[PDB]
Amino acid sequence: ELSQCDREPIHLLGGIQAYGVLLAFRGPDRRLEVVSANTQALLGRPPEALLGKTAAQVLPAELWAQWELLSARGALRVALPSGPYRALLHESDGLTVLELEPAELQPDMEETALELVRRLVSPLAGAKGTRELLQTAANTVRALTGFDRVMVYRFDADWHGEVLAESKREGMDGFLGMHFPATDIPVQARALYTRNPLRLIANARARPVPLVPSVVPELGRPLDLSGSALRSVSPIHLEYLRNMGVEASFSLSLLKDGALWGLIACHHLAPLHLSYERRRACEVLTQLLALQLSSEERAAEAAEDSHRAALLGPLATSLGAGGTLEEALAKDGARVLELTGATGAALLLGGEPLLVGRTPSMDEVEALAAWLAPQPFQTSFHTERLGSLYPPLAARADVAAGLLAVRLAPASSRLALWFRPEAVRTISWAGNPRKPAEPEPGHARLHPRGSFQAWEETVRETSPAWKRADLAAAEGFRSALIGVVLRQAAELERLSEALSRSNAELDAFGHTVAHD
Amino acid sequence: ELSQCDREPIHLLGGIQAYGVLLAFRGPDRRLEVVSANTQALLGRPPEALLGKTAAQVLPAELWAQWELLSARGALRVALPSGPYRALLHESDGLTVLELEPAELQPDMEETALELVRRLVSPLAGAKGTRELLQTAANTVRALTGFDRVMVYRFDADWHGEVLAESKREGMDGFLGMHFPATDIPVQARALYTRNPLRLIANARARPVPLVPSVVPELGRPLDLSGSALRSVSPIHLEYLRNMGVEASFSLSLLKDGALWGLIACHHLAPLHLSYERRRACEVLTQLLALQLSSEERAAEAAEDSHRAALLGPLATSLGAGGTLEEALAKDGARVLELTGATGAALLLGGEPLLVGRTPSMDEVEALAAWLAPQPFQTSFHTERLGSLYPPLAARADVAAGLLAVRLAPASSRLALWFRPEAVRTISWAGNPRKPAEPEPGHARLHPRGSFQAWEETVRETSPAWKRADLAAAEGFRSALIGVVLRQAAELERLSEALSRSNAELDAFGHTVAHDLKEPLRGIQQYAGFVMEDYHGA
Numbered sequence A: 001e002l003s004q005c006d007r008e009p010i011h012l013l014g015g016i017q018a019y020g021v022l023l024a025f026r027g028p029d030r031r032l033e034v035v036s037a038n039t040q041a042l043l044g045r046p047p048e049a050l051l052g053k054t055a056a057q058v059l060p061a062e063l064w065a066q067w068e069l070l071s072a073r074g075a076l077r078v079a080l081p082s083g084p085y086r087a088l089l090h091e092s093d094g095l096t097v098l099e100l101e102p103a104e105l106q107p108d109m110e111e112t113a114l115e116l117v118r119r120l121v122s123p124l125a126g127a128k129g130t131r132e133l134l135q136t137a138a139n140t141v142r143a144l145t146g147f148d149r150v151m152v153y154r155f156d157a158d159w160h161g162e163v164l165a166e167s168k169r170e171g172m173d174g175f176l177g178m179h180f181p182a183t184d185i186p187v188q189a190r191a192l193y194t195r196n197p198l199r200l201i202a203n204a205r206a207r208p209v210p211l212v213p214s215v216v217p218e219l220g221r222p223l224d225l226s227g228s229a230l231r232s233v234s235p236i237h238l239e240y241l242r243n244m245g246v247e248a249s250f251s252l253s254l255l256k257d258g259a260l261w262g263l264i265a266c267h268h269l270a271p272l273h274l275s276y277e278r279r280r281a282c283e284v285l286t287q288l289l290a291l292q293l294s295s296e297e298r299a300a301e302a303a304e305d306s307h308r309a310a311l312l313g314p315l316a317t318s319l320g321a322g323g324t325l326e327e328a329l330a331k332d333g334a335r336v337l338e339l340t341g342a343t344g345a346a347l348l349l350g351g352e353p354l355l356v357g358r359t360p361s362m363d364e365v366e367a368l369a370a371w372l373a374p375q376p377f378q379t380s381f382h383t384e385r386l387g388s389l390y391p392p393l394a395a396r397a398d399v400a401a402g403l404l405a406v407r408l409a410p411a412s413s414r415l416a417l418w419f420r421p422e423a424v425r426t427i428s429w430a431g432n433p434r435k436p437a438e439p440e441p442g443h444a445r446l447h448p449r450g451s452f453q454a455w456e457e458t459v460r461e462t463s464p465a466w467k468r469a470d471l472a473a474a475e476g477f478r479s480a481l482i483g484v485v486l487r488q489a490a491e492l493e494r495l496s497e498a499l500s501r502s503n504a505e506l507d508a509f510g511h512t513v514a515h516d
Numbered sequence B: 001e002l003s004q005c006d007r008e009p010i011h012l013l014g015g016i017q018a019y020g021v022l023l024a025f026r027g028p029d030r031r032l033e034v035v036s037a038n039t040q041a042l043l044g045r046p047p048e049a050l051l052g053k054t055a056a057q058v059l060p061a062e063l064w065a066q067w068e069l070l071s072a073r074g075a076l077r078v079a080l081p082s083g084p085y086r087a088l089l090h091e092s093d094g095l096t097v098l099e100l101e102p103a104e105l106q107p108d109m110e111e112t113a114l115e116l117v118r119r120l121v122s123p124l125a126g127a128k129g130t131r132e133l134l135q136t137a138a139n140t141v142r143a144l145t146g147f148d149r150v151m152v153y154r155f156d157a158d159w160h161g162e163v164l165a166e167s168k169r170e171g172m173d174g175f176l177g178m179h180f181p182a183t184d185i186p187v188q189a190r191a192l193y194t195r196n197p198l199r200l201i202a203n204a205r206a207r208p209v210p211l212v213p214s215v216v217p218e219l220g221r222p223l224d225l226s227g228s229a230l231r232s233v234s235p236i237h238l239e240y241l242r243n244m245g246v247e248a249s250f251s252l253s254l255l256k257d258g259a260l261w262g263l264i265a266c267h268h269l270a271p272l273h274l275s276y277e278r279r280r281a282c283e284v285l286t287q288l289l290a291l292q293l294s295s296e297e298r299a300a301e302a303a304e305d306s307h308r309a310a311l312l313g314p315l316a317t318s319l320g321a322g323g324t325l326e327e328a329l330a331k332d333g334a335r336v337l338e339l340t341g342a343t344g345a346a347l348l349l350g351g352e353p354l355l356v357g358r359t360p361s362m363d364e365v366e367a368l369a370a371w372l373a374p375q376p377f378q379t380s381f382h383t384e385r386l387g388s389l390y391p392p393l394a395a396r397a398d399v400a401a402g403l404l405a406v407r408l409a410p411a412s413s414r415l416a417l418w419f420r421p422e423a424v425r426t427i428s429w430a431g432n433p434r435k436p437a438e439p440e441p442g443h444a445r446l447h448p449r450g451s452f453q454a455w456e457e458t459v460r461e462t463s464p465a466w467k468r469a470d471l472a473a474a475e476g477f478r479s480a481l482i483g484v485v486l487r488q489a490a491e492l493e494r495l496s497e498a499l500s501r502s503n504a505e506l507d508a509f510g511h512t513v514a515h516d517l518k519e520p521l522r523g524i525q526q527y528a529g530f531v532m533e534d535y536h537g538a
């Protein structure tokens, strides 16, 4: 593929954390094909000995009494001599696997989750703004998890990320408003996190615990761990955290109708374990954030569409009065521009092209109109930097930074478009984007960024991104160009009664030659 | 416009249900001025003698210990020698009001609450549709509350509503599929329910306990009960509930966006009392359901509008393929009809109107267009019925029952409209709506309906409602219509090349006016050829 950062498989690591013990059951005969190598403390027997025997005589006597509801719903609490343990059950890779982990110790915690979900679902939330919703979710995440530093991470088109908001406690650095390279998150990571919503790495210094046996005898590969929540992450990502200085990690993915909208991040300077109940409560909390944001964007787009219609109102009303379309646009050009938020407009109906406001030279516009012919689009065209697609205008980007074009007609040569100037924008990177990874002699792998200090770069010949409202405003301008062009048709309609008058002029000079 | 069902107030009854006990406080030292008459058991002292004295000695010592957290949070579970109670505290009418209610005897209900929450939100919820979401909500509400019958009530424009889905229990009657008159819920009821979502009527035949004293001295009014959740409903609604035979009621309000879009009702045939945590858990269910309904509706409507644009596309392309607009519409008359789903399409660009599909004759549509010109509509005018508004075409309601129209020009007489035939449907009424109420002798109050048997009636000369996608499709029809108006600009240049041979004919008019003036030059030339003759004669 592109790099070792992607070709590396994540399913087949076969690494398990030291917190719990993983056990496996094979079909009806209850075969323990693969077991953890740290089961001596819990199971009281050597790990290698337990291979190949039945589940009837190996497990502690307690949890068969709890086996029924474990097979029913996959969760319970069981008492053990070492202490209270949390039991989860899931079946994957054509085999049944069982695991045990420590559980909570504060019974008062459970009602807190209900209280906080009530607070979040309570009305008047989101009216304050979209941005504050992320912070008022992150602060509650801090309270539930009790971690140190929490960011909110949002994905861009090219899979690079930004920090929309964060909530921390005093005494640590913050990455608010910082961007990160797209390659920092591998593609296989996105594919895996599409299915598994959450994950937990409570220690960074811990060595991975080997899985015995190394490979399943008949599968030919080690046991899959995607379904389990105790998987050990790749060692490469560990050095990234260690250089970052984080000891414990906890991330929850946000899903929007099949799209990885963003990730919640949590960090800690010291190792700290966390229970399954807290994880699931946090997951339930994060699930409603997508719905809240959906409601917010529906309301915002409704307001924007209403505002665009309101602005369309008087522009259409003024058109149709005394004058011609070229006269009307020239006289009423002030109200034209704000529909698309541009600085110049151009229309081509068959005559010489007409320009209003800031625009490229007269000779260039028809060259562009010809240039727009072959690119396949049906209604609209978009660009934030036309210089890539069309080099000649990149020489003078003062008005050619961004263009929005629309088909007034079918594939024939009739078009209208708008122009935008360039806006300076400066962004701050964490490390050098040019060197996302630090190479090592021997090319065994690619080490992560050496440092994490803020670094700034400036982009030029770029226009602010086209919104979604102006895309509909283009169709609105088409619906307003009708009406004014229909008044053109009405003035041509009394030119049509003047065509009846022209036939009257025909037979008028007819009876005039009759008279002379 | 207000019958007797809109005069009496609800928040000034001053009645409290049998199970509860009400207490109110005034002033920084929090003296006692309002107390229920059934407080003999819990307080152990005559109610009258305790009002106006120091609050600390009146309240039991156990309750006074946990005052601090109850003051802030407002909810608390406490233990009494009689049993376990839940204390509710709230502020209303500039007064401190606390409440005492029996507590729940079930320890682990909250785990079930979280289980139902995670069931509803789901990794994938409501993929099937809205109706399935309502059905899922109904039976979950039943399970969480343990009631017999539940309702889902949705309001129309005129505040008259029908039931969509229900969770139905065996061995008892249901109400799914009928409508209820808007008179059932008065304006005052909607105004009150706009704020308080939780309404519980523990008993139907219980008599409200009076609050001594009847009137607050400084205010001159009965103590407000809107803030509290133990209000006693008006006796007329108690009789209305008794007529059904239902004993206990539970009503949740689905306030999605500043409006009472939906009401969730629960019924039971036997006395029953719920716990406060039950109501609090059920409260978030309504918000979840409303939010998911809104999200699903928006997503589905956006997806359908995408298909509308996708169908708009090839219509525009094909219409721009041929250069005979009237003929193209005639041959492609099928396609234009399903853009808004109408059956009769009429085009009027100022010339002779074009008629395709089922439509009335030209004179009726011309008269309708003439009437539409002074009729004020900003961009569009859509209605399902026209006989109510326009008399002359009411006779021809077969095809002119409903129409959707848009204004092509900003002014004048350029209108494009469609035609829709009448659609017949049957609405089932629970009880005859023609007799909404029965008047008692003396006209003191209007008692509710007597019998609730199903009743039927038929609506006529009506068309299905123009749902918003149709209006969006008409606007998109104008938007892609500008495409065929650029094709009509090619046709405009065809009319203008007729006018261009007419402009060459205008230059012809110039030099033929020169010709028809210089033929008079030959006229005065003949006059000159005669002028020496007439001079010789003279």
Ligand SMILES: */C=C\C1=C(C)C(=O)N/C1=C\C1=NC(=C\c2[nH]c(/C=C3\NC(=O)C(C=C)=C3C)c(C)c2CCC(=O)O)/C(CCC(=O)O)=C1C
Pocket (backbone or CB within 6 Å): A004, A005, A006, A010, A153, A161, A180, A183, A184, A185, A186, A189, A199, A232, A233, A234, A236, A237, A240, A249, A250, A251, A263, A265, A437, A446, A447, A448
């Ligand atoms: C190709 C390997 C590799 C390099 C080099 C690189 O840049 N990424 C990487 C390793 C992996 N990272 C994995 C996990 C992972 N990394 C991030 C990155 C961030 N952490 C932040 O808080 C932050 C900022 C903002 C970013 C962009 C994240 C979010 C993840 C997911 C899990 C958490 O770290 O929480 C990873 C996956 C391994 C596995 O799932 O076992 C790889 C391969």
Ligand SMILES: */C=C\C1=C(C)C(=O)N/C1=C\C1=NC(=C\c2[nH]c(/C=C3\NC(=O)C(C=C)=C3C)c(C)c2CCC(=O)O)/C(CCC(=O)O)=C1C
Pocket (backbone or CB within 6 Å): B004, B005, B006, B010, B151, B153, B180, B183, B184, B185, B186, B189, B199, B232, B233, B234, B235, B236, B237, B240, B249, B250, B251, B263, B265, B437, B446, B447, B448
């Ligand atoms: C004059 C008002 C009035 C007449 C007459 C009438 O038709 N109803 C009525 C009395 C009131 N009822 C009030 C509350 C109330 N009524 C209903 C009605 C229904 N219950 C159903 O199951 C159902 C169906 C649908 C209908 C039509 C409902 C749902 C409520 C809210 C509380 C519950 O009953 O659950 C009322 C409000 C004042 C008060 O609280 O006393 C009036 C005036």
